[PDB]
Amino acid sequence: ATGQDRVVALVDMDCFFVQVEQRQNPHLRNKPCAVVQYKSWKGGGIIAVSYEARAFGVTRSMWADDAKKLCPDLLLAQVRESRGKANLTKYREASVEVMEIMSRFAVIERASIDEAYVDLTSAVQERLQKLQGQPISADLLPSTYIEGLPQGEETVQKEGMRKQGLFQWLDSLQIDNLTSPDLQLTVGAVIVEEMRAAIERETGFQCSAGISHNKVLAKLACGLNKPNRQTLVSHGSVPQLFSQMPIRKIRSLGGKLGASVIEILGIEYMGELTQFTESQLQSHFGEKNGSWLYAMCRGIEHDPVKPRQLPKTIGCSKNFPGKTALATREQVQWWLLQLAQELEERLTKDRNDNDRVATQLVVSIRVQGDKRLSSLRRCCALTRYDAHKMSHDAFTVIKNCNTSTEWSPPLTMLFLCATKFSAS
DNA sequence: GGTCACACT
DNA sequence: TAGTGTGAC
Ligand SMILES: Nc1ccn([C@H]2C[C@H](O)[C@@H](COP(=O)(O)NP(=O)(O)OP(=O)(O)O)O2)c(=O)n1
Ligand SMILES: [Mg+2]
Ligand SMILES: [Mg+2]
C-alpha cells in the first residue's frame, strides 16, 4: 500500500505546564515564563518554557538562575511540593480536561500528559458522507498549514504564505472523489480545527496538531508550525519533506538506533533511506527495526492508534544525587513511606475514577556509582492500598542490597511503581 | 528531575 | 521476571 489507509492526528499542547500555571495565574499570561521544580538548587530546574521565554533562549533543563541571566524578567511558577517531593497533580488533572474533550470526537491514545493521538478515519468517512459533493472552504481551516505549499506579495507575511499554500491545496483538491486520501486528510484537518477550538474554548489551553496517515507523520507535522497551529502532512509531500529531514527527527530515531542508522549507512536524511533494499536494512538493524525503517522513510507506518485514554501504570520516584544519597536505613524507610503515601493517594483516586486496581508493586533503586538508572528492580504483590504496608513491603524487597542501622552503598534513587491493573 | 511505554530475552 | 535497557514527554 501507500500507507494512506488511515487518517491520524496528534494533538500536542503548547508549553503545557506553563499554560496551566498561566490560566491559574493571569499575571503570567503573555509573558516570558517558565515552570520550575526544587527552587533551592540553582534556582530550580526548568521543566517548561513559555514561547516568549524561548525567544530569549531559555530552555528546559536549564537552571532557573542561568535562565534569569538570559531573561532577567523571566517569570517562574514552582511545581507544588508535597511530602518533600514535586507533585504533578495539577498538570495530570489539567491533562484529563484535554483528554476528555478529545475523547468526544474520536478514539484517542494518550501518548503523554500533554498529547494524544487520534484515529479520525471513521469520523472522516461519516463527515464526507454528511457533506456531499461539497467543496471545503478555507474558512474551515483557519489555522491549517499545508506542508510543501505554497509552491510552483503577501508571501512576505507568514499568514499570507499560509493562505496561499492552503488555497493551492484546496484548488487542487477533487472533492467528487470520496476515496481520495488527500481529501480525507483535508476533512480530517477540518475536524482537528473543531477539536482544537473546543479544547481552547473549554480549557483555555492552546494546542497544535499534525494530520497525516500515520502516528509518526502526524507527530512530525504537529511540530512544524507550533504554536497554536495545525499542519497537514500529505503522502505526496513526504519526498521533499524527508529529503532534508534529519533522521533523529523521526520518532524513535532520536537515540542510539538513529545514530547507528546514520553511522552504518553514512546518511543524514530520512529520504536517503529509500536507496536501500528492505533486506539490506534488516541485515544491519534486524527484522523489526529494518522493516519499520524501510516503510517509514517512505512515509509508511502501521503502528495503530491504541485505544488507551488512561495510563497503564502509576509511579512515584525521587532522586538523591551526590551527597544527598541516603546512607541510613531509617532514611530509606522514610522516603519509601513518602513515595508510598503519594502513590496511595493516586491509587485510591484512580480506583474511584477508573474502576480498576493495581495488583503488582514495583520497587526500583539506584546505588551510588552505578551507571544504570536502576541498580536493581524488584517486585512484590500489592494487595492493599496502604502506604505503610507498601513502604514496608518495598523495604523488605530491597533491604538485602545494603552491605554492613546504616545503608551502604547510599541510594541515589528510589522508585515505586504500581502496575498490572485489574478491573474492580 | 520526574514519569511514561515497550522491545527485548 | 521476571528483570533490563531504549526512547519519550
Ligand atoms: N523532559 C521533560 C519534557 C516534558 N515535560 C513536561 C513539562 C511540559 O510542559 C510537558 C509537555 O511536554 P512537551 O510537550 O514536550 N513540551 P511543552 O508542552 O511544554 O511545549 P511545546 O513545545 O510542546 O509547545 O511535560 C517534562 O516534565 N520533562
Ligand atoms: Mg507540548
Ligand atoms: Mg508533548
Domain limits, chain A: 1-14+85-246, 15-84, 247-304, 305-424
Within 10 Å of residue A270's Cβ, how many Cβ atoms? Answer: 27
Resolution of the model in angstroms: 2.9
d(CA A51, CA A71): 12
E-strand ranges in A51-141 read 75-78, 80-82, 85-87, 107-112, 115-119
Taking alpha carbons only, the member of A12, A75, A10 closest to residue A206 is: A12
A410, A326 Cβ separation under 8 angstroms: yes
Label residue A38 exposed, middle or buried (CB < 10 Å: 0-12, 13-18, 19+).
Answer: middle
Which amino acids bring their CB within 6 angstroms of ligand 1? Answer: A 12-17, 47-48, 60, 113-114, 226-227
Q: Which of A 86-145 have CB under 7 A of nucleic chain C?
A: 111-115
Cell representation of residue A182: 488527500
Q: Which of strand B's nucleotides are less than 7 A from any protein C-beta?
A: 1-8
Q: Is the dihedral of CA A126, A215, A15, A321 positive or negative?
A: positive
A16 alpha carbon – ligand 2 mean position (Å): 5
Q: Which nucleotide is nearest to A17 (CA to C1')?
A: C9
Please, which residues bridge with residue A275 across strands?
none
A49 alpha carbon – ligand 1 mean position (Å): 8
Label residue A362 exposed, middle or buried (CB < 10 Å: 0-12, 13-18, 19+).
Answer: buried
d(CA A207, CA A410): 43
- Nearest 5°: CA angle at A351, between A346 and A355? 150
Q: Which of A 243-272 have CB under 7 A of nucleic chain C?
A: 251-258
d(CA A102, CA A61): 30
Nearest CA to ligand 1 atom 4: A47
Provide the 3-class DSSP secondary structure of residue A269.
strand
A116, A11 Cβ separation under 8 angstroms: yes
DSSP assignment letter at A308: B
- CATH-assigned architecture of domain A1-14+85-246: 2-Layer Sandwich (3.30)
CATH class of A305-424: alpha beta
* Nucleotide C5 C1' to residue A182 CA (A): 40
A115, A11 Cβ separation under 8 angstroms: yes
CATH superfamily of A247-304: 5' to 3' exonuclease, C-terminal subdomain (1.10.150.20)
Q: Scanning the structure block, which residue is given the C-alpha cell 530509606?
A: A332
A114 alpha carbon – ligand 3 mean position (Å): 5
d(CA A404, CA A370): 18
Burial state string for A59-83 with b = 16 or more CB within 10 A and e = fewer than 16:
eeebebeebbeebeebbbbebeeee
A60, A48 Cβ separation under 8 angstroms: yes
Sheet containing A75-78: order of strands: A45-49, A33-37, A75-78
* Nucleotide B8 C1' to residue A253 CA (A): 17
Residues with CB under 5 A from ligand 2 (ion): A 12-13, 16, 114
d(CA A198, CA A31): 24
Which experimental technique did the depositors report for determining this structure? X-ray
Provide the 3-class DSSP secondary structure of residue A370.
coil
CATH topology of domain A15-84: MutS, DNA mismatch repair protein, domain I (3.40.1170)
> What is each CA distance from A129 to A6, A184, A190, in whole angstroms?
17, 11, 14
A182 touches strand C (CB under 7 A): no
Is the bond into A410 cis (omega within 30 degrees of 0)? no
Q: Which of strand C's nucleotides are less than 7 A from any protein C-beta?
A: 1-9
Nearest CA to ligand 1 atom 3: A47
CATH topology agreement for domains A1-14+85-246 and A305-424: no
Binding-site sequence positions of A: 12-13, 60, 114-115
> What is each CA distance from A303 to A215, A217, A251, A306, A343, in whole angstroms?
7, 11, 12, 9, 32
Biggest CA-to-CA distance, chain A: 79
E-strand ranges in A143-259 read 144-146, 207-212, 230-232
DSSP assignment letter at A372: S
Burial state string for A218-227 with b = 16 or more CB within 10 A and e = fewer than 16:
bbbbbebbbe
- Closest ligand 1 atom number to CA of residue A226: 24
Taking alpha carbons only, the member of A177, A158, A159, A143 closest to residue A11 is: A143
Long-range contacts of range A300-304, CB-CB < 8 Å, 24 or more positions apart? Answer: A300/A1, A300/A2, A300/A3, A300/A214, A301/A3, A301/A214, A301/A215, A301/A216, A301/A217, A302/A3, A302/A214, A303/A214, A303/A215, A303/A216, A304/A119
* Nucleotide B7 C1' to residue A318 CA (A): 26
Q: Which nucleotide is nearest to A13 (CA to C1')?
A: C9
A190, A197 Cβ separation under 8 angstroms: no
> What is each CA distance from A90 to A16, A24, A199, A231, A299, in whole angstroms?
11, 10, 17, 29, 37
- Closest ligand 1 atom number to CA of residue A51: 24
- Nearest 5°: CA angle at A206, between A202 and A211? 105
A48: left (phi over 0), alpha (psi -120 to 50) or beta: beta
